[PDB]
């Protein structure tokens, strides 16, 4: 069976949630379901990101980084897929996966997902990034009601999953130490407590898995086979050796038109064999504009949806003018954030002045969108790693680096304003009184930030 059609290559960049969705063209589009979520990332990775920027890598740092990252993350991906999970999105060295199931099957699926989690940790027992540095992962699990949001215009589409289970998995995974599997409170509440031995996490209702101790007669393979009854797209029969059913997709121009809207044009160029397959793995100077949209505690998905949509419509128009791309969209703890990048495949130009002007335009517009409580934007400029991360069958373009993290922390630690780093401030074709030098905050994962500035804008008022 020939499988290497463009439609199949596009499907590598998307979950089954999207590939096999069959939803309307209205934007926003929302749907509601239940599932179990897994959030996982890799320890010692930042350490490596640093190693690969240095001269010892002889101009092949981005190539070597992408290789070693994909070596590890593709193993995680394969575990997830063989356990029946759907990888939703990647961000750097992190990924979110979903096992969508009927409410009645949540108990047994939690068991599957815990076993998957333990098998993931098992890959990394004894593993080192390099001699002297271990590679381990941290896992959070959650379960419950999940909403999906699809937003976009006639040319581009984005999706998010939303709700308390989504917030829960992020919180769980944040409490995890290397080697941990943390369960959300609701996940512990819904699980097969007869089989899962936990310990309390101090000052938290979330719990830590110590062991899976199944009954004497339990057989995991048989249990798993029964669970597959409820997995609509588990590869089976003649396709039992495939990691994904999506590998069997056949040409279908209406489906392909829908799916391509989720994928960046430079990626589609590679997929169409009009660009070299290695061209997107690079350490390149970019400017990151990280936009955070905060909603109220009580806001439901049905009001968040339209507001994201409205914000998006303006974001995309401004980025187009200023030559920027949306690299990734995230949502947790009532903040929807857009990781925007100026300068990447082909787009290099007063990149700084424009990133700042774009940020102010976004800030001013979004601040007026109904339901958006606070807009915050962090702007940082520097060398970042760009590349397609994941497995051959399930991968995405992503950006990794200290300036990405810096922009992300700025937007959270300095809410309600537009902030920029020192590179941006100094490089800009703009006068000093357009800025305000800020108090320096101690920020998680942040270096010495260097001086940080608010972009005040062109007038006092
Ligand atoms: N809300 C949301 N949706 C998706 Cl599909 C992904 C995503 N993020 C951020 C989150 C991580 C954990 C819970 S939400 C993944 C890509 C890092 N956030
Ligand atoms: Cl870096």
Coordinates of C-alpha atoms and ligand atoms in Angstrom, one line a residue:
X1 CA 0.0 0.0 0.0
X2 CA 1.5 3.4 -1.1
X3 CA 1.0 5.8 1.7
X4 CA 3.1 8.9 0.9
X5 CA 0.5 11.2 -0.5
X6 CA 0.5 14.9 0.4
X7 CA -2.8 14.5 2.3
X8 CA -1.0 11.9 4.5
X9 CA 2.0 14.1 5.0
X10 CA -0.3 17.0 6.1
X11 CA -2.1 14.7 8.5
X12 CA 1.3 14.1 10.4
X13 CA 1.0 17.6 11.7
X14 CA -2.6 17.1 13.2
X15 CA -4.3 15.0 15.8
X16 CA -7.1 12.6 14.9
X17 CA -9.3 15.1 16.8
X18 CA -8.9 17.2 13.6
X19 CA -8.1 14.7 10.9
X20 CA -11.2 12.7 11.5
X21 CA -13.4 15.6 12.8
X22 CA -16.3 16.5 10.5
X23 CA -17.3 19.8 11.7
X24 CA -19.0 22.8 10.3
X25 CA -17.2 25.8 8.6
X26 CA -18.6 28.4 11.1
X27 CA -15.8 29.9 13.2
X28 CA -15.7 29.6 16.2
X29 CA -16.7 25.9 16.3
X30 CA -17.0 24.2 19.7
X31 CA -17.7 20.7 20.8
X32 CA -17.8 18.9 24.1
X33 CA -16.6 15.5 25.2
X34 CA -14.9 13.6 28.0
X35 CA -11.4 12.1 28.2
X36 CA -8.1 11.6 29.9
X37 CA -5.2 13.9 29.2
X38 CA -1.5 13.4 29.5
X39 CA 1.1 16.3 29.6
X40 CA 4.6 15.4 29.4
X41 CA 8.0 17.1 29.1
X42 CA 11.7 16.4 29.3
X43 CA 14.2 17.2 32.0
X44 CA 17.8 18.4 31.3
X45 CA 16.6 19.8 28.0
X46 CA 17.2 23.5 28.6
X47 CA 20.8 22.5 29.6
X48 CA 21.1 20.8 26.1
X49 CA 19.5 23.9 24.3
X50 CA 22.4 25.8 25.8
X51 CA 25.2 23.3 24.8
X52 CA 23.9 23.4 21.1
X53 CA 24.1 27.1 20.6
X54 CA 27.9 27.2 21.2
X55 CA 30.8 27.0 18.8
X56 CA 31.7 23.4 19.7
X57 CA 28.8 22.4 17.4
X58 CA 30.5 23.9 14.4
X59 CA 27.5 25.4 12.7
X60 CA 25.4 22.2 13.0
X61 CA 23.9 22.9 16.4
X62 CA 20.3 23.1 15.1
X63 CA 20.8 19.8 13.2
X64 CA 22.2 18.0 16.2
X65 CA 19.6 19.5 18.5
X66 CA 16.7 18.4 16.2
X67 CA 18.2 14.9 15.9
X68 CA 18.7 14.2 19.6
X69 CA 15.3 15.7 20.5
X70 CA 13.5 13.7 18.0
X71 CA 15.3 10.5 19.0
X72 CA 13.8 10.8 22.5
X73 CA 10.5 12.5 21.7
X74 CA 9.7 10.1 18.9
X75 CA 9.9 7.2 21.5
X76 CA 7.5 9.0 23.7
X77 CA 5.2 9.5 20.7
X78 CA 5.3 5.9 19.8
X79 CA 4.3 4.8 23.3
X80 CA 1.4 7.2 23.4
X81 CA 0.2 6.0 20.0
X82 CA 0.5 2.3 20.7
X83 CA -1.5 2.9 24.0
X84 CA -4.2 4.5 21.9
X85 CA -3.7 8.1 22.6
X86 CA -4.0 11.1 20.3
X87 CA -1.1 13.6 20.4
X88 CA -2.8 17.0 20.3
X89 CA 0.1 19.5 20.1
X90 CA 3.8 19.8 20.7
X91 CA 5.6 22.8 22.2
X92 CA 9.3 22.5 22.3
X93 CA 10.1 19.3 24.2
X94 CA 6.5 19.0 25.6
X95 CA 3.4 17.4 24.3
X96 CA -0.3 17.0 25.3
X97 CA -2.1 13.9 24.5
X98 CA -5.7 12.8 24.7
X99 CA -7.8 9.6 25.1
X100 CA -11.3 10.7 24.2
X101 CA -13.9 8.2 25.6
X102 CA -17.4 7.9 26.9
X103 CA -17.8 8.7 30.6
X104 CA -18.4 5.0 31.5
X105 CA -15.0 4.1 30.1
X106 CA -13.0 6.8 31.9
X107 CA -12.1 4.5 34.8
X108 CA -10.6 1.8 32.7
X109 CA -8.8 4.3 30.4
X110 CA -7.1 6.0 33.3
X111 CA -5.6 2.6 34.0
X112 CA -4.3 2.4 30.3
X113 CA -2.9 5.9 30.5
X114 CA -1.1 5.2 33.8
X115 CA 0.5 2.1 32.3
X116 CA 1.5 4.2 29.3
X117 CA 3.0 6.8 31.7
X118 CA 5.0 4.2 33.6
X119 CA 6.3 2.7 30.3
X120 CA 7.4 6.2 29.2
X121 CA 9.4 6.6 32.4
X122 CA 10.9 3.2 31.7
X123 CA 12.4 4.3 28.4
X124 CA 14.5 6.8 30.3
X125 CA 15.8 4.8 33.3
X126 CA 19.6 5.1 33.0
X127 CA 19.5 7.4 29.9
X128 CA 21.8 10.4 29.5
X129 CA 21.5 13.5 27.2
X130 CA 25.3 13.3 27.2
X131 CA 27.7 11.7 29.8
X132 CA 27.0 13.5 33.2
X133 CA 23.5 14.7 32.3
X134 CA 20.4 12.4 32.7
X135 CA 17.3 12.6 30.6
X136 CA 14.1 12.1 32.5
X137 CA 10.5 13.2 32.0
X138 CA 7.7 14.6 34.1
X139 CA 4.0 13.6 33.6
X140 CA 0.7 15.0 34.7
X141 CA -2.6 13.2 34.1
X142 CA -6.1 14.6 34.3
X143 CA -9.6 13.5 33.4
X144 CA -13.1 14.9 33.0
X145 CA -15.1 17.1 30.7
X146 CA -13.1 18.7 27.8
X147 CA -14.3 21.3 25.2
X148 CA -12.6 21.8 21.9
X149 CA -12.5 25.2 20.1
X150 CA -11.7 25.7 16.4
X151 CA -11.1 29.2 15.3
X152 CA -9.7 30.8 12.2
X153 CA -10.5 32.5 8.9
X154 CA -11.1 31.2 5.3
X155 CA -7.4 30.4 4.9
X156 CA -6.1 29.4 8.4
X157 CA -7.4 27.2 11.3
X158 CA -6.3 26.7 14.9
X159 CA -7.6 24.6 17.7
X160 CA -7.4 24.3 21.5
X161 CA -8.8 22.1 24.1
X162 CA -10.3 23.9 27.1
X163 CA -11.8 23.3 30.6
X164 CA -10.9 22.4 34.1
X165 CA -9.4 19.0 33.1
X166 CA -7.0 21.0 30.8
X167 CA -6.0 23.4 33.6
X168 CA -5.7 20.3 35.9
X169 CA -3.3 18.5 33.7
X170 CA -1.1 21.5 33.4
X171 CA -1.1 22.0 37.2
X172 CA -0.4 18.2 37.8
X173 CA 2.5 18.1 35.5
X174 CA 4.0 21.3 37.0
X175 CA 4.2 19.5 40.4
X176 CA 5.9 16.5 39.0
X177 CA 9.6 15.9 39.6
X178 CA 11.7 13.9 37.3
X179 CA 10.2 10.4 37.2
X180 CA 6.8 11.3 38.6
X181 CA 3.3 10.6 37.3
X182 CA 0.9 13.0 39.0
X183 CA -2.9 12.6 38.9
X184 CA -5.3 15.5 39.1
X185 CA -7.8 15.3 41.9
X186 CA -10.6 14.4 39.6
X187 CA -8.4 11.8 37.9
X188 CA -7.8 10.2 41.3
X189 CA -11.5 10.4 42.0
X190 CA -12.5 8.7 38.7
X191 CA -9.8 6.0 38.7
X192 CA -9.7 2.3 39.7
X193 CA -8.4 2.9 43.2
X194 CA -8.5 -0.8 43.8
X195 CA -5.4 -1.0 41.5
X196 CA -3.5 2.3 41.8
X197 CA -1.4 3.0 44.8
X198 CA -0.8 6.7 45.5
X199 CA 0.8 9.1 47.9
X200 CA -0.4 12.5 48.8
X201 CA 1.4 15.6 47.5
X202 CA 2.0 18.2 50.3
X203 CA -0.2 21.2 50.1
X204 CA -2.0 19.8 47.1
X205 CA -5.1 17.6 46.5
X206 CA -3.3 16.1 43.4
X207 CA -1.6 12.7 44.1
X208 CA 1.5 10.8 43.0
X209 CA 1.4 7.3 41.5
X210 CA 3.7 4.9 43.4
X211 CA 2.5 1.6 41.8
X212 CA 0.0 -0.1 39.6
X213 CA -0.7 -3.3 41.5
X214 CA -3.4 -5.1 39.6
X215 CA -5.2 -8.2 40.9
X216 CA -3.6 -11.7 40.7
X217 CA -5.6 -12.7 37.6
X218 CA -5.4 -9.4 35.7
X219 CA -3.7 -9.5 32.3
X220 CA -2.8 -6.1 30.9
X221 CA -2.8 -7.2 27.2
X222 CA -6.3 -8.6 27.5
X223 CA -7.5 -5.6 29.4
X224 CA -6.0 -3.3 26.7
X225 CA -7.7 -5.3 23.9
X226 CA -11.1 -4.8 25.6
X227 CA -10.4 -1.1 26.0
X228 CA -9.7 -0.8 22.2
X229 CA -13.4 -1.5 21.6
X230 CA -14.0 2.0 22.6
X231 CA -11.1 3.5 20.5
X232 CA -12.7 4.5 17.1
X233 CA -9.4 4.8 15.2
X234 CA -7.1 2.2 16.8
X235 CA -5.2 0.6 13.9
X236 CA -6.4 -2.9 13.5
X237 CA -6.7 -5.9 11.3
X238 CA -4.9 -5.5 8.0
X239 CA -3.6 -2.1 9.5
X240 CA -2.6 -3.5 13.0
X241 CA 1.1 -2.7 12.2
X242 CA 0.5 1.0 11.6
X243 CA 1.0 3.6 14.3
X244 CA -1.8 5.7 13.0
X245 CA -4.9 5.2 10.9
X246 CA -4.1 8.6 9.3
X247 CA -1.3 6.9 7.5
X248 CA -4.1 5.2 5.3
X249 CA -5.7 8.4 4.2
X250 CA -6.3 8.7 0.5
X251 CA -6.5 11.7 -1.7
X252 CA -9.6 13.8 -1.0
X253 CA -9.4 17.4 -2.1
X254 CA -12.1 18.8 0.2
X255 CA -10.5 17.1 3.2
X256 CA -7.0 18.3 2.2
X257 CA -8.3 21.8 1.8
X258 CA -9.5 21.8 5.4
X259 CA -6.4 20.1 6.8
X260 CA -3.9 22.4 5.1
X261 CA -5.3 25.4 6.8
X262 CA -3.7 24.3 10.0
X263 CA -0.2 24.0 8.7
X264 CA 2.2 26.9 7.8
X265 CA 2.9 27.6 4.1
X266 CA 6.7 26.8 4.5
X267 CA 5.8 23.4 5.9
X268 CA 3.3 22.8 2.9
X269 CA 6.2 23.8 0.6
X270 CA 8.3 21.0 2.0
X271 CA 5.4 18.5 2.0
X272 CA 5.0 19.3 -1.7
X273 CA 8.7 18.6 -2.4
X274 CA 9.3 22.2 -3.4
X275 CA 11.7 23.0 -0.5
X276 CA 14.5 20.9 0.9
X277 CA 13.4 18.6 3.8
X278 CA 16.1 20.0 6.2
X279 CA 15.6 23.7 5.4
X280 CA 13.5 24.4 8.6
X281 CA 15.9 23.1 11.1
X282 CA 17.8 26.3 12.0
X283 CA 19.2 28.5 14.8
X284 CA 18.0 31.8 13.6
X285 CA 17.5 35.4 14.9
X286 CA 13.9 36.1 15.4
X287 CA 11.7 38.3 17.5
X288 CA 9.1 36.6 19.6
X289 CA 5.8 38.4 20.4
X290 CA 3.9 36.4 23.0
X291 CA 0.4 37.6 23.4
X292 CA -1.7 36.6 26.5
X293 CA -5.5 37.1 26.6
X294 CA -7.0 36.6 30.1
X295 CA -10.7 35.8 30.7
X296 CA -12.6 35.8 34.0
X297 CA -12.6 32.9 36.5
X298 CA -16.4 32.2 35.8
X299 CA -16.2 32.5 31.9
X300 CA -17.4 29.5 30.1
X301 CA -16.1 28.1 26.8
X302 CA -19.2 29.4 25.0
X303 CA -18.2 33.0 25.7
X304 CA -14.4 32.5 25.4
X305 CA -14.8 31.1 21.9
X306 CA -16.1 34.1 20.2
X307 CA -13.7 36.4 21.9
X308 CA -10.7 34.3 20.8
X309 CA -12.1 34.4 17.3
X310 CA -12.5 38.1 17.4
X311 CA -9.0 38.6 18.7
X312 CA -7.6 36.2 16.1
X313 CA -9.1 38.0 13.2
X314 CA -7.3 41.1 14.2
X315 CA -4.1 39.3 15.1
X316 CA -3.8 37.6 11.8
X317 CA -4.4 40.9 9.9
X318 CA -1.7 42.8 11.8
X319 CA 0.8 40.0 11.6
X320 CA 0.3 39.9 7.8
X321 CA 1.1 43.6 7.6
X322 CA 4.1 43.3 9.8
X323 CA 5.3 40.0 8.3
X324 CA 4.8 37.7 11.4
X325 CA 3.5 34.1 11.9
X326 CA 1.5 32.4 14.6
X327 CA 3.7 29.5 15.7
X328 CA 1.5 28.0 18.4
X329 CA -1.6 28.8 20.4
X330 CA -2.0 27.6 24.1
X331 CA -4.8 27.9 26.7
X332 CA -4.8 27.2 30.5
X333 CA -5.8 29.0 33.7
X334 CA -8.2 31.3 31.8
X335 CA -5.3 32.7 29.6
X336 CA -5.2 32.1 25.8
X337 CA -1.7 32.8 24.5
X338 CA -0.4 33.2 20.9
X339 CA 3.3 32.5 20.2
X340 CA 4.1 34.9 17.3
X341 CA 7.4 35.0 15.5
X342 CA 8.9 37.6 13.3
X343 CA 11.8 36.6 11.0
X344 CA 11.3 32.7 10.4
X345 CA 11.1 30.6 7.1
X346 CA 11.8 33.4 4.4
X347 CA 10.3 36.3 6.4
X348 CA 13.5 38.3 7.5
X349 CA 13.5 42.2 7.2
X350 CA 13.2 46.9 11.0
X351 CA 12.0 43.6 12.3
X352 CA 12.2 45.1 15.9
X353 CA 10.4 48.4 15.2
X354 CA 7.7 46.5 13.5
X355 CA 7.4 43.7 16.1
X356 CA 6.8 46.5 18.7
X357 CA 4.3 48.4 16.6
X358 CA 2.5 45.1 15.8
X359 CA 2.4 44.3 19.6
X360 CA 0.9 47.8 20.4
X361 CA -1.7 47.4 17.6
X362 CA -2.7 43.9 19.0
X363 CA -2.7 45.2 22.5
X364 CA -5.0 48.2 21.6
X365 CA -7.4 46.1 19.6
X366 CA -7.7 43.1 21.9
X367 CA -8.1 45.3 24.9
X368 CA -11.4 46.3 23.4
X369 CA -12.7 42.8 22.7
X370 CA -15.7 41.9 24.8
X371 CA -14.9 39.4 27.4
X372 CA -11.1 39.9 27.3
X373 CA -10.2 41.1 30.8
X374 CA -6.5 41.7 30.4
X375 CA -4.1 41.7 27.4
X376 CA -0.4 41.2 28.0
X377 CA 2.4 41.0 25.4
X378 CA 6.1 40.1 25.8
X379 CA 8.6 40.9 23.1
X380 CA 12.1 39.3 23.1
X381 CA 14.7 39.0 20.3
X382 CA 17.5 36.6 19.8
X383 CA 18.7 33.3 18.4
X384 CA 16.1 30.5 18.7
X385 CA 16.0 26.9 17.5
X386 CA 13.3 26.2 14.9
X387 CA 12.4 22.8 13.6
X388 CA 9.9 19.9 13.1
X389 CA 9.7 18.0 16.3
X390 CA 8.2 14.6 16.9
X391 CA 7.9 11.3 15.1
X392 CA 7.7 10.7 11.3
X393 CA 3.9 9.9 11.8
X394 CA 3.2 12.7 14.2
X395 CA 5.2 15.9 14.3
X396 CA 4.9 19.7 14.3
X397 CA 7.0 22.8 13.7
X398 CA 8.0 24.5 16.9
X399 CA 10.5 27.0 18.4
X400 CA 12.7 26.5 21.4
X401 CA 15.0 28.9 23.2
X402 CA 15.7 31.3 26.1
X403 CA 14.1 34.2 24.3
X404 CA 10.9 32.2 23.8
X405 CA 10.8 31.4 27.5
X406 CA 11.7 35.0 28.4
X407 CA 8.8 36.4 26.3
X408 CA 6.4 34.0 27.9
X409 CA 7.5 34.9 31.4
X410 CA 7.4 38.7 30.7
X411 CA 3.8 38.4 29.5
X412 CA 2.8 36.7 32.8
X413 CA 4.9 38.7 35.3
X414 CA 4.1 42.0 33.7
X415 CA 0.4 41.8 33.0
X416 CA -1.6 44.3 31.2
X417 CA 1.2 46.0 29.3
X418 CA 3.5 45.5 26.3
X419 CA 7.1 44.6 27.5
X420 CA 10.3 44.1 25.6
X421 CA 13.8 42.9 26.3
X422 CA 17.1 44.8 25.9
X423 CA 17.9 43.6 22.4
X424 CA 14.6 44.9 21.2
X425 CA 14.7 48.2 23.0
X426 CA 18.3 49.0 21.8
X427 CA 17.9 47.8 18.3
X428 CA 14.6 49.5 17.6
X429 CA 14.5 52.5 15.2
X430 CA 12.5 54.3 18.1
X431 CA 13.4 57.0 20.7
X432 CA 13.9 56.4 24.4
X433 CA 10.8 58.1 25.8
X434 CA 8.6 55.6 23.9
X435 CA 9.7 53.2 26.6
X436 CA 9.7 52.9 30.3
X437 CA 12.5 50.9 32.1
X438 CA 10.9 48.4 34.5
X439 CA 11.5 47.0 37.9
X440 CA 13.3 43.6 37.6
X441 CA 11.3 40.6 38.7
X442 CA 12.7 37.2 39.5
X443 CA 11.1 34.9 36.9
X444 CA 10.9 31.1 36.7
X445 CA 13.4 29.7 34.4
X446 CA 14.9 33.1 33.6
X447 CA 18.6 33.7 33.3
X448 CA 19.4 37.3 33.9
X449 CA 16.7 38.7 31.8
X450 CA 18.8 41.9 31.3
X451 CA 17.0 45.3 31.6
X452 CA 13.3 45.0 30.6
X453 CA 11.2 47.8 29.2
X454 CA 7.6 48.7 28.8
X455 CA 6.7 49.8 25.4
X456 CA 4.7 52.9 26.4
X457 CA 4.1 54.1 22.9
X458 CA 4.4 57.4 21.0
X459 CA 2.4 59.7 23.4
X460 CA 2.1 60.2 27.1
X461 CA -1.6 59.4 27.0
Ligands
LIG1 N1 -5.3 24.5 25.6 C1 -4.4 23.9 24.9 N2 -4.8 23.1 23.9 C2 -3.9 22.4 23.2 CL1 -4.5 21.5 21.9 C3 -2.6 22.5 23.7 C4 -2.2 23.3 24.7 N3 -1.0 23.4 25.2 C5 -0.8 24.0 26.5 C6 -1.2 23.0 27.7 C7 -0.4 22.2 28.3 C8 -1.1 21.5 29.3 C9 -2.4 21.8 29.4 S1 -2.8 23.0 28.2 C10 0.0 22.3 24.9 C11 0.8 22.6 23.6 C12 1.4 22.7 25.0 N4 -3.2 24.0 25.3
LIG2 CL1 18.7 29.3 23.7

